[PDB]
Design an enzyme around this catalytic site. Structure first.
Site, mmCIF file in Angstrom:
data_model
loop_
_atom_site.group_PDB
_atom_site.id
_atom_site.type_symbol
_atom_site.label_atom_id
_atom_site.label_comp_id
_atom_site.label_asym_id
_atom_site.label_seq_id
_atom_site.Cartn_x
_atom_site.Cartn_y
_atom_site.Cartn_z
ATOM 1 N N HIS A 41 0.806 -1.216 0.000
ATOM 2 C CA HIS A 41 0.000 0.000 0.000
ATOM 3 C C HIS A 41 0.841 1.269 0.000
ATOM 4 O O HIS A 41 0.268 2.364 -0.004
ATOM 5 C CB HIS A 41 -0.988 0.014 1.173
ATOM 6 C CG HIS A 41 -0.359 0.028 2.539
ATOM 7 N ND1 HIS A 41 -0.056 -1.126 3.232
ATOM 8 C CD2 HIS A 41 -0.063 1.054 3.375
ATOM 9 C CE1 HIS A 41 0.437 -0.810 4.419
ATOM 10 N NE2 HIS A 41 0.440 0.506 4.530
ATOM 11 N N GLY A 143 3.916 5.446 10.671
ATOM 12 C CA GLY A 143 5.248 5.321 10.117
ATOM 13 C C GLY A 143 5.943 4.007 10.412
ATOM 14 O O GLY A 143 7.076 3.809 9.954
ATOM 15 N N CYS A 145 4.654 0.969 9.564
ATOM 16 C CA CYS A 145 4.375 -0.019 8.530
ATOM 17 C C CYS A 145 5.680 -0.506 7.938
ATOM 18 O O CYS A 145 6.587 0.284 7.660
ATOM 19 C CB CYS A 145 3.502 0.561 7.424
ATOM 20 S SG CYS A 145 1.726 0.349 7.673
#
Lengths: 300, 15
Positions: A41, A143, A145
């Site tokens: 993503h 942040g 991920c």
């Protein structure tokens, strides 16, 4: 002596954490040899997330749409492909600090260490368990991920990559082959975390750890059958103890001399009459986030 | 909804 939530040492993984930016979107990536692995993503935008078509989005991206930074040093993206929910970015340089590694998918109930990272820089390392509903009770901010979970066998077993936070404050992610643990999807839609249960084998392993450490008030004289224990356990939303769980407790029963069904009986007591305001290993609840292997490491 | 922990986070459509 003692017992503590203990993570694997993180140094082998710290040297694989890079930063990956795609326009406005930024998250962490895992840099192994000449590939960087990250949540796909990163190629989206907030508007896309409602119902995103990752197939087209990837077509319209080009290698230059990806900025990868490992420290101050930029890495050049020379190819890109997608494997399930994970994006693989080919880079020109092979990671000199690549450790011996392998991609494993873990069973629910197994633990791993999480290296939480921000903008490709590590911030901290803690232990986590794959809950029975395929979620983890992590600690992640905006942040993070692309942070990963691993175990060390000198070979690193990567087994988790962080994607989203469910509404209950609980997290969901994938393995390094891009497949989500559980039924979750990297798209904005209503996603429930199931009803959870307690990991029986782990509570047992914990009680062994307590005995090894001198805390044995809860030991009783009775015993039970595996089947009669499971009948009581399930009533308390405990996972049913399996024959394979029984074998795995083997080292702990051998070290303590207490057979598995002996401990199941002691646990049955705790499940029925509670603890009565006492602490097993300084904790007033029963702990289910230590695997038997985890206990063997700290009490070897 | 859910939140994606980019950046930069994908939130809460929610609002």
């Amino acid at each position: 002596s003692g017992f503590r939530k203990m993570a694997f040492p993180s140094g082998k993984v710290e040297g694989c954490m890079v930063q990956v930016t795609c326009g406005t979107t930024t998250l962490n990536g895992l840099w192994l040899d000449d590939v960087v692995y990250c949540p796909r993503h990163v190629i989206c935008t907030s508007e896309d997330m409602l119902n995103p078509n990752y197939e087209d989005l990837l077509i319209r991206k080009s290698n230059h749409n990806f900025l990868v930074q490992a420290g101050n040093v930029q890495l050049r993206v020379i190819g890109h492909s997608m494997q399930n929910c994970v994006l693989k970015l080919k880079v020109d340089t092979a990671n000199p600090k690549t450790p011996k590694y392998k991609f494993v998918r873990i069973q629910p109930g197994q633990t791993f260490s999480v290296l939480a990272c921000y903008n490709g820089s590590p911030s901290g390392v803690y232990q986590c368990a794959m809950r029975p509903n395929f979620t983890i009770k992590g600690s992640f901010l905006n942040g993070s991920c692309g942070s990963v979970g691993f175990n060390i066998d000198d070979c690193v077993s990567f087994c988790y990559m962080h994607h989203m936070e469910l509404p209950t404050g609980v997290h969901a992610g994938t393995d390094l082959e891009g497949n989500f643990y559980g039924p979750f999807v990297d798209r904005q839609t209503a996603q429930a975390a199931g009803t959870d249960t307690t990991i029986t084998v782990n509570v047992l392993a914990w009680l062994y750890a307590a005995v090894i450490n001198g805390d044995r008030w809860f030991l009783n004289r009775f015993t039970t059958t595996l089947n009669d224990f499971n009948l009581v356990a399930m009533k308390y939303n405990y996972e049913p103890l399996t024959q394979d769980h029984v074998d795995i407790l083997g080292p702990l029963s051998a070290q303590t001399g207490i057979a598995v069904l002996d401990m199941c009986a002691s646990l049955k007591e705790l499940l029925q009459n509670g603890m009565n305001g006492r602490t097993i290993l300084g904790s007033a609840l029963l702990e289910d986030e230590f695997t038997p292997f985890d206990v063997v490491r700290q009490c070897s | 909804x859910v939140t994606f922990h980019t950046x930069x986070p994908f939130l809460x459509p929610x609002g």
